[PDB]
Amino acid sequence: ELGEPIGQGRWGRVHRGRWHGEVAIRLLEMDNQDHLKLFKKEVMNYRQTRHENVVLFMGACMNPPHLAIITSFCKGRTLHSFVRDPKTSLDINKTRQIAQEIIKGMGYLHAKGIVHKDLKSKNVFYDNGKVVITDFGLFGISGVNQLKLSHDWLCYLAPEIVREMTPGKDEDQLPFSKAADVYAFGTVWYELQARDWPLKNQAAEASIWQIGSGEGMKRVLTSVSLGKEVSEILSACWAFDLQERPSFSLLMDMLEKLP
Amino acid sequence: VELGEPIGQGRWGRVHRGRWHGEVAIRLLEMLKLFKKEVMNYRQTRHENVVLFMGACMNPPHLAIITSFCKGRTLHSFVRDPKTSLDINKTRQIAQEIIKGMGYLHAKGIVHKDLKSKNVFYDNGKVVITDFGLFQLKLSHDWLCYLAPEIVREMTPGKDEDQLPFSKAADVYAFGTVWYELQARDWPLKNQAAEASIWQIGSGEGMKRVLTSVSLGKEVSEILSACWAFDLQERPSFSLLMDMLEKLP
Amino acid sequence: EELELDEQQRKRLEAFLTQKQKVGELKDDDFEKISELGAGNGGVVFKVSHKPSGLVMARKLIHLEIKPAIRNQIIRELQVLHECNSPYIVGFYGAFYSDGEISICMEHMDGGSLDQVLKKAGRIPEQILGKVSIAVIKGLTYLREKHKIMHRDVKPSNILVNSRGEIKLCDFGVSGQLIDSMANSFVGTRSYMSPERLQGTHYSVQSDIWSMGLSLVEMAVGRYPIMAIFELLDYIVNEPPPKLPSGVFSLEFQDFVNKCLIKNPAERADLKQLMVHAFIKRSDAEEVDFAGWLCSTIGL
Amino acid sequence: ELELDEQQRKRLEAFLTQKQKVGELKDDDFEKISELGAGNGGVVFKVSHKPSGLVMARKLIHLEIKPAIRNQIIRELQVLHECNSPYIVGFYGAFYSDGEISICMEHMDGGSLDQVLKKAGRIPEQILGKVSIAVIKGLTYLREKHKIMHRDVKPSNILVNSRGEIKLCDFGVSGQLIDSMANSFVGTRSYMSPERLQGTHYSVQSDIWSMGLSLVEMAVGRYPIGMAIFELLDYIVNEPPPKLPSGVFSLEFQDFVNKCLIKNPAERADLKQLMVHAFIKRSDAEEVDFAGWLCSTIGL
Ligand SMILES: CNS(=O)(=O)Nc1nccc(Cc2c(C)c3ccc(Oc4ncccc4F)cc3oc2=O)c1F
Ligand SMILES: CNS(=O)(=O)Nc1nccc(Cc2c(C)c3ccc(Oc4ncccc4F)cc3oc2=O)c1F
Ligand SMILES: Nc1ncnc2c1ncn2[C@@H]1O[C@H](COP(=O)(O)OP(=O)(O)NP(=O)(O)O)[C@@H](O)[C@H]1O
Ligand SMILES: Nc1ncnc2c1ncn2[C@@H]1O[C@H](COP(=O)(O)OP(=O)(O)NP(=O)(O)O)[C@@H](O)[C@H]1O
Ligand SMILES: Nc1ncnc2c1ncn2[C@@H]1O[C@H](COP(=O)(O)OP(=O)(O)NP(=O)(O)O)[C@@H](O)[C@H]1O
Ligand SMILES: Nc1ncnc2c1ncn2[C@@H]1O[C@H](COP(=O)(O)OP(=O)(O)NP(=O)(O)O)[C@@H](O)[C@H]1O
Ligand SMILES: [Cl-]
Ligand SMILES: [Cl-]
Ligand SMILES: [Mg+2]
Ligand SMILES: [Mg+2]
Ligand SMILES: [Mg+2]
Ligand SMILES: [Mg+2]
């Protein structure tokens, strides 16, 4: 679509116009008005993000009660399905390269003051080497006697979050944080090594205590025998004290000095 | 915002394929395989100091290049506005924004070939670089002031620009003139015959007289002397320019 | 041995089998909805009329977003319930899938769950809990001896009673695929899970004993005897087990529950030891009109 | 010196009384006859005024500039109304139309010496002497009576006609027009003085160099230097100046051009010294039918 010319130059003419491109649209149903205000403040910041490991945030069409989030469509597979395909060949180099792409995009988001809140192998898209992070800043929204927790999601949740979990509490009151984002990356780093979840599928109650008490991740780091340097990165990201978990800028160096 | 087929379902609603109508800028050009190789690399660029490269369509006889439409004023018009309050801090902050964007392109192996104040957009602090990778004799005075001596020494009527020695070191030279416009709010060479400018630039005597006669700070001038270096091998990199700008008064 | 068939029980089981012999394959159109009996943790249960026969059934609906391949593995694994025939196990009619949900059509227990009875009766007296403890034990041995499967979800809401005086178990881990599909999803406000299960340690029928003990203490005092759910789970793991008030209940009952609520599953009493316990030896010789008490308490 | 011949004064007086009949010039008042050429952002047409019967030469300069400075260009070009000389092309008027600035001037049917050289191959010495007089006389007229230099002396800006006249055009009469277009165009030959190339201070002495280099090109029929334009310019700045071949042209001519092509403008000959030079004393006394030679050479 070509529009009105805006100035003349030596290299042809430059017009205004409109472009139609393939995108991904997430629809959400909204159940106070201060919700939409906070969402607006976030999507303005998200619209300014620029990083080749972060999905391009196109914008949001707020048409009450339907909320639409528009991002660029991601070619490729999720890292979740990529690592669980037996026909995929991983190694100490491939996993480090994939990790550092994730670290670079996360480090950028935290530099822009954006906590992801749901970093997981399902929200990372792999496409012949290219690594892109999706679905950042989507747990603080407010929309449509028992909690419903998936096994996949629990493996990424830090102890401080599952300790405040209780039926009836809104999820936007859970302590999501940069440190919690690092902890989730710890699980992503585990999947890159073991091609599977860190905790056995079991009752959600048992998962909550094993994560909230720190004993689960300890048994994993003990029973599962990976490389000593690989295990160190894992224990740093999974540190019980959130204040002992490294930053992503520090994780980049830790990853870089692997075998 | 036209909908499409649902891809999958999760805790956070449903996700569908779709298309979106977005505000973009289009540049039309009449006239090849290098374009195909370049535009694939240009579309993957992501940096908040570099304009978004949407893509390019080639319907003969026109070659359309599609980028994000930039709000704000060109750095050319910005520095040339009497109200614009520039200072050793604001000029350094603006310059460092361009350096970060130029450094990224060079890291991706992309020579800009046309860095200038008219290809930089300023918007309430936000700085974005445009028009990268685009490159009888009609030579504008504005363009000559950004051209490195090795480029003007090889300018010959009839020769395509594809033979001109564009390079990262030339890009640094063009940045030097941008830095000068940030200091003096004007071109470095007086308006004169293009022939006189060609010799003054190609011989290196032009910027030498500029640095001499002008009363710019020793630190500010050192940036200029480094960028405008006659020997292109002596010009710094943008990653090095970052630290040089950071350590200014 | 302790699964010996009483004559009235054998005829009731025989009757239920010949009643079940005439229903056939269950479809959604067969069922007319009477009332909703309750819900919780991804499942809702209706009282239902199966129109081909006249049978009033209980229909449990489990909403599950899963592939049809493993959905049929659930329906296939539930067929084992056809071989779970005991006076202490709830009868199974059939299981099918419709409109995103899995249906499990079972025997309707008109007395509901002891969780409901407790809500109306306030507390359950010791003599009545003796009859309940026998049935839970016998039912658990039946699943272990005859089907090699443990319950995994013993609690007052899954112990069903009826005006005939019967005490039967339901909602036990009969389908491995159904377990893994819905177990890690839901978490409630109360917990009856053993400490070893919470700690993720190897768990056996000994964990079901813990749940039975904790259930008896709740049903005796009429209050959950143990706030973010993690604190609750952490209490079960690191803090001492609950116990009955002192002056109220008999010593044999206190000893019975305390041997059920031993944190170490190896030192916790097993089913053969509980079968010959003083509280059971006494409660089993006792004559109790459970059918009468149940009706007069809840209004049947 | 610099005073008017009787035939010249009447021809100038005739042109002025003819110029007193044009009035305000509009685009509609002109019918295009032919295109005479183009160069440096300007195309020139032979046209015909409609109010008068006058054949004019109309130069069109494309300039993307604000109308404020566009009117300053038109205002500064009005000075041409006071540039009345037999060695300066006459001026009829100037206006703006559809983004282009029009300069309507006297038509010289002989064209430029650049065009004559292309058809003549070379121009003999006795005729270049008649050219040299007019250039000097035209330059000193602009300096004496208007205090402005030419800034663009070269064969393309020396016009001739079948009457035998030799006049200068395209000189820097408008400061705003100089500043608007000079920085835009660069050709393949350069007639600019070394001091202008170096950006140092310059004067009418720079026009002397341009005349001298023009004489050398028109004598040998080839641009005497030589490629990249910078190499051409750097040769002008740092290499020795050109000179005429010895055996052909007279010594007085060789000394005339050598005294014009001295790199140091202070040591370069000025207008007054060139006016009394041996080559000028000789060429001015000579009788040469330039009107006849021009027509027979180009074909008129
Ligand atoms: C908290 N403990 S846990 O975390 O282990 N989760 C689980 N525990 C135990 C079991 C399961 C799954 C399951 C369920 C819930 C289930 C429900 C009804 C059912 O119908 C009848 N039931 C008994 C008698 C007659 C019937 F018709 C069969 C069922 O079979 C099942 O397997 C769990 F997910
Ligand atoms: C290369 N040297 S430079 O860089 O100085 N460039 C320049 N040189 C010289 C002049 C200028 C500007 C200009 C131009 C181009 C011009 C052209 C025609 C004109 O009409 C007549 N002219 C003379 C006699 C009669 C006329 F009708 C008036 C003009 O008036 C002007 O002033 C330059 F830009
Ligand atoms: N992506 C863009 N967004 C907004 N304005 C733009 C964009 N690209 C170009 N322009 C403007 O469009 C006009 C023409 O662009 P352009 O052809 O690049 O001329 P220029 O670069 O400004 N000067 P020149 O060197 O002669 O081309 C200028 O006013 C630019 O500032
Ligand atoms: N930008 C995207 N491009 C392409 N596919 C996408 C994109 N975002 C999400 N998807 C896919 O669309 C489906 C639904 O998205 P989503 O609701 O985010 O599910 P999920 O993240 O994989 N699991 P959950 O965490 O429970 O939402 C999944 O298969 C995603 O992999
Ligand atoms: N066959 C049945 N006859 C009568 N009532 C029944 C029957 N099956 C289930 N119920 C009742 O249905 C209600 C809901 O049961 P259910 O959906 O299994 O959740 P719950 O056991 O109460 N708690 P939870 O296990 O955490 O979901 C309970 O109050 C039971 O008493
Ligand atoms: N008054 C005139 N009468 C006849 N021919 C003219 C007249 N004025 C200009 N011309 C011719 O018009 C053509 C173009 O002239 P012009 O636009 O001044 O460029 P140029 O001087 O020839 N080349 P450049 O060095 O780029 O300026 C040349 O062939 C001139 O001889
Ligand atoms: Cl940099
Ligand atoms: Cl439970
Ligand atoms: Mg997602
Ligand atoms: Mg541009
Ligand atoms: Mg139940
Ligand atoms: Mg001319």
Structural resolution in Å = 2.8
Mutate to test the pocket of ligand 6, among D36, D83, D152, D165 (most ligand atoms within 8 A of CB): D36
Is D206 within the bounds of a domain?
yes
Do residue C135 and residue C89 come from a single domain?
no
Residue located via tokens 């100046």: D241
Contact B93, B245 (CB under 8 A): no
Instruction: Quote the CA–CA distance of D188 and D166 in Å, as a whole number.
Output: 25
Is D164 within the bounds of a domain?
yes
Do residue C166 and residue C293 come from a single domain?
yes
Do residue C123 and residue C256 come from a single domain?
yes
User: For residue D268, what are the CA distances in angstroms to C157, C234, D152, D206, D260?
Assistant: 116, 103, 18, 9, 6
Other Cβ atoms closer than 10 A to A239 = 19
Distance D67 CA to ligand 9 centre (A): 58
Is D99 within the bounds of a domain?
yes
Task: Give me the helix-helix angle, A248-256 and A228-237, nearest 10°.
Answer: 180
Which residues have a Cβ under 8 Å from the Cβ of D213 and sit 6 or more positions away?
Answer: D191, D224, D242, D260, D261
Partner-chain residue, chosen from B11, B19, B46, that has the shortest CB–CB distance to A52: B46
Do residue C149 and residue C77 come from a single domain?
no
**C223 DSSP 8-state letter:** S
User: What is the DSSP secondary-structure string of B5-19?
Assistant: -EEEE-SS-EEEEEE
Which residues have a Cβ under 8 Å from the Cβ of D276 and sit 6 or more positions away?
Answer: none
Return left, alpha or beta for D285; rule: phi > 0 is left, psi -120 to 50 is alpha, else beta: alpha
**C79 DSSP 8-state letter:** G
Report the relative pairing of strands C92-98 and D91-97 from DSSP bridges.
Answer: unpaired
Do residue D101 and residue D32 come from a single domain?
yes
**3 state DSSP class of C279:** helix
User: For residue D40, what are the CA distances in angstroms to B142, B157, B194, B241?
Assistant: 17, 14, 11, 39
Query: D55 in contact with B at a CB cutoff of 8 Å?
Result: no
Joined tokens for residue A86: 């037996």
Q: Which experimental approach was used here?
A: X-ray
Is C2 within the bounds of a domain?
no
Within 214-233 of C, beta carbons closer than 8 Å to A belong to 227-230, 233
- Name the residue range of residue D69's domain: 6-106
Measure CA of the first residue to CA of the last residue in chain D; give whole Å.
32
Joined tokens for residue C236: 């079960």
Instruction: Quote the CA–CA distance of D237 and D229 in Å, as a whole number.
Output: 12
Do residue D136 and residue D258 come from a single domain?
yes
Q: Is any ligand 6 atom within 6 A of the Cβ of residue D190?
A: no
| Residue at which a domain ends, from D106, D139, D174 | D106
| Residue at which a domain ends, from D106, D140, D173 | D106
Instruction: Quote the CA–CA distance of D113 and D293 in Å, as a whole number.
Output: 13
Residues of D in contact with B140 (CB under 8 A): 183-184
| Residue at which a domain ends, from D58, D85, D106 | D106
Distance C171 CA to ligand 1 centre (A): 4
Beta bridge partners of C32: C49
For the CA of D141, the nearest ligand: 2
Distance D157 CA to ligand 12 centre (A): 4
Instruction: Quote the CA–CA distance of A110 and A127 in Å, as a whole number.
Output: 24
Longest CA pairwise span in chain A (Å):
69
Domains along the sequence of chain B with CATH: 73-246 (1.10.510.10)
Q: What is the CATH number of the domain that holds C53?
A: 3.30.200.20
Q: Is any ligand 2 atom within 6 A of the Cβ of residue D91?
A: yes
H or E segment at A95?
A: helix A92-111
Cβ neighbourhood burial of B33 (10 Å; 0-12, 13-18, 19+)? exposed
Is D22 within the bounds of a domain?
yes
Do residue D58 and residue D116 come from a single domain?
no
Is D139 within the bounds of a domain?
yes
Q: φ, ψ for residue D182 (rounded to 5)?
A: -65, -35
Measure CA of the first residue to CA of the last residue in chain A; give whole Å.
52
Do residue C194 and residue C133 come from a single domain?
yes
Alpha carbon D210 to chain centroid, angstroms:
10
**3 state DSSP class of C130:** helix
Instruction: Quote the CA–CA distance of C92 and C179 in Å, as a whole number.
Output: 18
Q: A40: distance to nearest CA of chain C, Å?
A: 32
Q: Is any ligand 2 atom within 6 A of the Cβ of residue D300?
A: no
Do residue C64 and residue C131 come from a single domain?
no
Is D98 within the bounds of a domain?
yes
Q: What is the CATH number of the domain that holds C162?
A: 1.10.510.10
Q: How many domains does chain C have?
A: 2
Within 143-182 of C, beta carbons closer than 8 Å to A belong to 180
Contact C88, C135 (CB under 8 A): yes
Cβ neighbourhood burial of B228 (10 Å; 0-12, 13-18, 19+)? buried
Q: φ, ψ for residue B248 (rounded to 5)?
A: -95, 150
- Among C89, C254, B4, which Cα is nearest to A73's? B4
Instruction: Quote the CA–CA distance of D257 and D209 in Å, as a whole number.
Output: 9
- The total number of residues shown for chain C amounts to 300
Is D52 within the bounds of a domain?
yes
User: What is the DSSP secondary-structure string of D238-271?
Assistant: HSPPP---TTTS-HHHHHHHHHHS-SSTTTS--H
Instruction: Quote the CA–CA distance of D54 and D106 in Å, as a whole number.
Output: 9
Do residue D235 and residue D127 come from a single domain?
yes
Do residue C179 and residue C287 come from a single domain?
yes
- Among B18, B19, B23, which Cα is nearest to B5's? B18
- In the residue annotation, C284 being an active-site residue is answered as no
Do residue D76 and residue D218 come from a single domain?
no
Residue located via tokens 């003007």: B152
**3 state DSSP class of D276:** coil
Instruction: Quote the CA–CA distance of B245 and B117 in Å, as a whole number.
Output: 18
Residue located via tokens 């007193």: D20
Instruction: Quote the CA–CA distance of B213 and B200 in Å, as a whole number.
Output: 15
User: Annotated binding residues of D for ATP, as ranges?
Assistant: 36-44, 59, 105-108, 112-115, 154-157, 170
- Among A6, A14, A7, which Cα is nearest to B62's? A14
- Among A208, A206, A207, A258, which Cα is nearest to A234's? A258
